[PDB]
């Protein structure tokens, strides 16, 4: 049976080689993308649109938010030194929360957010918080309380930061699939991974591009530059192109309009910076906001232009987390990446 | 007070330092000074295993020294027949980002896992003959970097969440958790009796664990950067680590410190994988420079080079009978060396 089982071995092999050949065609025809974002980057909202047109954890965040305030206010009278409120006009705010708590399937009305937010600036309500050591309170309580103004919004999608505080994520990696002009894309974004990336990021050395989403107008912007500087110069990622989404242009526009100079104090060279003359502002926007957004772009290109060498490229894009044009930018960038990869094999560039 | 506990940690750290210098009055390079060198070890590629579409991240030899499983990040476990180069099974994985694979000593299962944070057990000798997922072990909160079977029903995993876990495969439950590392855990190696294992982490330290008691016995420092690779000496009384500081080191469990450092001035890249030959006279180490160096583990001289890969050497394994070395690479090839 030495030759009998050698013909069964080599025939099971060629069957696998046929399946491996169909595998190869599917693997080659798909573009793989890594989505890396800042904590408040707004990455997830961009995924939310790339998906609808697994971030469904919006309600769970609200659960812990509602469950947090209820314990704090219900413990006010329970404490042996009972805690008094700083403003008596917040009395009715406590009343409402004391009733609506411990009910199934709460809707979270804005009036609830009004009492919840208004109670948190109250010193007396906060006074019991430092005594939350003596009673039982959720770990991620003060984090979400400061963030209610973000959560009141209709379009709220939990950032990764938000998901780490709670124990919502069970999945190491999330995958999004989409198709632009009959070309398939596999977008990945890490879920339950620690903030140390230096080991698992080497897995993505052969992706078509890394989609790097920056929470523009935030330091958190110097932090994004250092992460991009680490990705750009990594030994294993210096043949990987980076698609750079400078995300919160709409919030960046508002702060420069108002006079919120967190940008200039964090970057003293913003004072002696002038908009490049070949800039293309969106007609109907402040000549100061086009300066602020082109300054952040010029920070990433300072890193990018050094040590590029034609191995990989940076594609900066001013974006907004609510845009259907974003998948097209990725598709166009990936076409340029693939064309340059092919042109470099023929030594045409 | 926290600051009082810190200053007690330093003096206990000085006491172990002093209790280790007490027994380190002779070096391994004095004991092994008259030992005649092994000679130029010249291995050649005997088999190149082609069929993976993307870089190979891990491999494991089966205990019969003929079948080996290899994981690539195109999403495939391939089980090869190294003698005839015929693929026995090709397993498509649910998550493509596999970072480790294990062959059961009984030969009936493989395991794999990666950035999905799950270790997946596959039944090879099933009812109707097609490989299917039998159990999925979830509970790690970081990527699964290494998995090693104890028997058909237990498996140890190391994870990016800085812990290792002992599993019961029949019920899918974590029988034990091994905490104590500060960086994430990159590799583990079982002792020949399987009652202990050692883990190497991204905090430049290695730890020895009692499998049945769940606690750390000894901690080994000396490396300067993240430890990528760990492997037990054939008798279970020593192990060798490979780190990003470009050196390999050898530690003895009973002297409770390191004995040997394997480094050269021209070697400035991290070690990805280590493995001993059957007798433990050679230490084989894969490198980021696309090469594998053979080290005379008793004299710390380089004895040879495995020089046939076009990309990073990612994994490395020696058969149980000691007949061949398998090297996996980011160029998507497996090479078998003699």
């Amino acid at each position, epitope marked *: 049976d030495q030759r009998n089982e050698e013909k069964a071995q080599r025939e099971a092999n060629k069957k696998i080689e046929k399946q491996l050949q169909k595998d190869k065609q599917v693997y080659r025809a798909t573009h793989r993308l890594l989505l890396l974002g800042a904590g408040e980057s707004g990455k997830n909202t961009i995924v939310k649109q790339m998906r609808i047109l697994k971030a469904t954890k919006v309600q769970d965040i609200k659960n812990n938010l509602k469950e947090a305030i209820e314990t704090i206010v219900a413990a006010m009278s329970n404490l042996v030194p009972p805690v008094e409120l700083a403003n008596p006009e917040n009395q009715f705010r406590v009343d409402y929360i004391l009733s609506v708590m411990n009910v199934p399937d709460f809707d979270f009305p804005p009036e609830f957010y009004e009492h919840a937010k208004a109670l948190w600036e109250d010193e007396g309500v906060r006074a019991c918080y430092e005594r939350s050591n003596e009673y039982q309170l959720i770990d991620c309580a003060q984090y979400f309380l400061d963030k209610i103004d973000v959560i009141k919004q209709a379009d709220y999608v939990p950032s990764d930061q938000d998901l780490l505080r709670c124990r919502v994520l069970t999945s190491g990696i999330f995958e999004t699939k989409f198709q632009v002009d009959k070309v398939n894309f596999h977008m990945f974004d890490v879920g339950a991974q620690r903030d*140390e990336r230096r080991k698992w990021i080497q897995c993505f050395n052969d992706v078509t591009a890394i989609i790097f989403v920056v929470a523009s107008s935030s330091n958190r912007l110097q932090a994004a530059l250092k992460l991009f*500087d680490s990705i750009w110069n*990594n030994k294993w990622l210096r043949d990987t192109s980076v698609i750079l989404f400078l995300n919160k242009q709409d919030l960046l526009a508002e702060k420069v309009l108002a006079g919120k100079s967190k940008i200039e104090d*964090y970057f003293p060279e913003f004072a002696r910076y002038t908009t490049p003359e070949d800039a293309t502002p969106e007609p109907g926007e402040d000549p100061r906001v086009t300066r602020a957004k082109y300054f952040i772009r010029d920070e990433f290109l300072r890193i990018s232009t050094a040590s590029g060498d034609g191995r990989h490229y940076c594609y900066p894009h001013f974006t907004c987390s609510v845009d259907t044009e974003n998948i097209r930018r990725v598709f166009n960038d990936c076409r340029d990446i693939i064309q340059r990869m092919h042109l470099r094999q023929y030594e045409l560039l | 007070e926290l600051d009082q506990l810190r200053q007690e940690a330093e003096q206990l750290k000085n006491q172990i330092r002093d209790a280790r210098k007490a027994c380190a009055d002779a070096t391994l390079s004095q004991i092994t000074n008259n030992i005649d060198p092994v000679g130029r070890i010249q291995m050649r590629t005997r088999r190149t295993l082609r069929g993976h579409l993307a870089k190979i991240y891990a491999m494991h030899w089966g205990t019969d020294s003929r079948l080996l499983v290899s994981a690539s990040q195109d999403g495939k476990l391939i089980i090869w027949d190294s003698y005839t180069t015929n693929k026995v099974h090709a397993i498509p994985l649910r998550s493509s980002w596999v970072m480790t694979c294990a062959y059961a000593p009984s030969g009936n299962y493989v395991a794999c896992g990666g950035l999905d944070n799950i270790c997946s057990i596959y039944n090879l000798k099933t009812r109707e003959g097609n490989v299917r997922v039998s159990r999925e072990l979830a509970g790690h909160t970081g990527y699964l970097s290494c998995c090693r079977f104890l028997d058909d029903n237990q498996i140890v995993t190391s994870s990016g969440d800085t812990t290792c876990a002992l599993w019961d495969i029949e019920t899918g439950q974590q029988t034990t958790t091994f905490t104590g590392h500060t960086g994430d855990v990159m590799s583990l190696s079982l002792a020949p009796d399987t009652r202990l294992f050692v883990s190497g982490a991204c905090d*430049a330290s290695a730890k020895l664990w009692d499998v049945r008691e769940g606690m750390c016995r000894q901690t080994f420092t*000396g490396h300067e950067s993240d430890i990528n690779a760990i492997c037990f000496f054939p008798n279970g009384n020593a192990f060798a680590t490979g780190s990003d500081d470009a050196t390999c080191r050898l530690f003895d469990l009973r002297a409770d410190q390191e004995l040997m450092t394997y480094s050269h001035d021209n070697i*400035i890249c991290g070690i990805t994988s280590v493995s001993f030959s059957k007798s433990g006279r050679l230490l084989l180490a894969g490198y980021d420079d696309f090469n594998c160096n053979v080290w005379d583990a008793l004299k710390a001289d380089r004895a040879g080079v495995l020089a046939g890969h076009d990309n990073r050497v990612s994994c490395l394994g020696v058969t149980d009978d000691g007949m061949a070395v398998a090297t996996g690479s980011w160029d998507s090839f497996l090479k078998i060396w003699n």
Partner: nanobody
Amino acid sequence: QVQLQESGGGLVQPGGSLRLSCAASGFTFSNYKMNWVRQAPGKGLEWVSDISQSGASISYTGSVKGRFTISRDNAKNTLYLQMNSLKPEDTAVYYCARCPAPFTRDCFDVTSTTYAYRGQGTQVTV
């Protein structure tokens, strides 16, 4: 055993001066890129300054440029941070952080919460 021990620090007046020191041991100091990283009360860790292996290439977070000076002594295995004209927004625990791997341009994770190759910190209070 990689060990980083920050020295200097302590209470100082606004506009004052301090010189933090980092006595490193257990690794080839000249092979690694070194960083200063600080954690203000309430906020997370953030990068202040880095210096390359030789000491020629230097960078700073923008809020300290012109006021801080980083330097290393490769013979004495020491990192320095000269802090001139301190402002109360400089009150932080200051950590000396090593880049995880030698001979690299990239420096991952030094601002991470549980980064191994970081000291315990000196409290600077302005």
